[PDB]
Ligand SMILES: COc1cc(C)cc2oc(=O)cc(CP(=O)(O)O)c12
């Protein structure tokens with residue numbers, strides 16, 4: 001299932017969909033894995049999230065060149081923290097168009113991130129305003145409300161059973177919601193449930209820090225979040 005490629009790991013989840021995994025030795029927390037996605041849409045490739053670093057993100061592009069060998073049309077990043085946005089410069093060096101929540105781009109400088117080139121905005125119900133996500137193919141971008149951070153966004157893959165929760169969603173056996181230092185404790189539970197309701201047919205839930213799981217990842221994350229209120 002897992003393919004080791006240098007210091008990174010890649011796993012095919014479905015036809016046209018792979019999970020990328022990178023690791024950073026965070027002092028006091030061990031070597032933390034972070035997951036994103038790679039999607040083939042016809043003759044082009046779409047990326048969800050960078051790796052932790054520019055060098056690791058360049059390695060993602062190298063793997064894409066070896067295993068898919070099609071241009072990367074765009075990347076979308078799911079919030080302004082290092083595990084999701086730390087490799088923005090590598091995407092720009094490669095000529096890839098980059099997208100993030102407008103709020104992520106506003107927060108990026110003070111968070112130590114490089115902003116994406118383009119800003120997504122969202123309707124009151126959470127769905128991306130379509131003009132701000134042009135040519136996204138099967139990617140369906142949804143802002144579920146504040147949770148892990150105020151700017152966290154999520155992505156479904158049309159034509160598959162897959163939806164991606166980023167750092168908002170933890171697996172069905174997770175012991176806690178992890179670092180809540182930037183989190184919205186009042187709204188987390190509703191935001192997790194809003195993600196599940198936005199993608200009701202997704203039976204494979206992908207997330208930043210655990211392997212793909214069933215929808216019990218959503219119910220368990222929300223149930224743990226109920227206790228924050
Ligand atoms: C940004 O990421 C992290 C940073 C640091 C310094 C420690 C961490 O320790 C963990 O065990 C999990 C993460 C990922 P998270 O902040 O939950 O998105 C992590």
Ligand SMILES: [Zn+2]
Pocket residue numbers: 079080081148149167
């Ligand atoms: Zn974060």
Ligand SMILES: [Zn+2]
Pocket residue numbers: 034083166167208209
């Ligand atoms: Zn994370």
